[PDB]
Write a protein that binds this ligand. Structure first.
Ligand SMILES: Nc1nc2c(ncn2[C@@H]2O[C@H](COP(=O)(O)OP(=O)(O)O)[C@@H](O)[C@H]2O)c(=O)[nH]1
Ligand SMILES: [Mg+2]
Length: 170
């Protein structure tokens, strides 16, 4: 089979995980998608000439059993850590997602991309500079996105794939 990249989209409720994923996969913006639905989505794409499958888990938070969370973190190869630029608590929550994914995978080298979503909105509580500072500390890319206008969306997911490739080659 073509190479498959198992991607996982994490972040606080309301940041745009579902909207980002549906924009990537289906090329349209959702105003409303139940915050409690967690599902996986698939798309065959070409990234830097490679035809590959993206298998993307749009997470929604607590699971029936914590074992289910740990399972998707172990199977996931790369993580989009999403906050919204108008939600400071969602940015603060990134510290927890960073930790938890490393903790479950028992690894210091986990492919991740920091995503500041909703950049089409002028309303902003997290300046680009502060997010750059956090991404610098993690040694990962930082991309601002809008699921609404599509700005940055392919970049966020394709960059994550490229981070996975860099990890695999070691
Ligand atoms: N303006 C704007 N609204 C967004 C964007 N992404 C998501 N939203 C809205 O933010 C709310 C939460 O989005 P959703 O995808 O359900 O967030 P989730 O809980 O992280 O899955 C919804 O009303 C979306 O329409 C974006 O980039 N721009
Ligand atoms: Mg959602």
């Amino acid at each position: 089979g073509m190479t498959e990249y198992k991607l996982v989209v994490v972040g606080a409720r309301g940041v745009g995980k579902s909207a980002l994923t549906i924009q990537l996969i289906q090329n349209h913006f959702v105003d409303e998608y139940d915050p409690t639905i967690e599902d996986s989505y698939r798309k065959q794409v070409v990234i830097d000439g490679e035809t590959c499958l993206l298998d993307i888990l749009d997470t929604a938070g607590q699971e029936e059993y914590s074992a289910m969370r740990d399972q998707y973190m172990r199977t996931g190869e790369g993580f989009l850590c999403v906050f919204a630029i108008n939600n400071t608590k969602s940015f603060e929550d990134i510290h927890h997602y960073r930790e938890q994914i490393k903790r479950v995978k028992d690894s210091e080298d986990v492919p991740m991309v920091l995503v500041g979503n909703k950049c089409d909105l002028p309303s902003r509580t997290v300046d680009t500079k502060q997010a750059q500072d956090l991404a610098r500390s993690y040694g990962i890319p930082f991309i601002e996105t809008s699921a609404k206008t599509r700005q940055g969306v392919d970049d966020a997911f394709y960059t994550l794939v490229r981070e996975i490739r860099k990890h695999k080659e070691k």
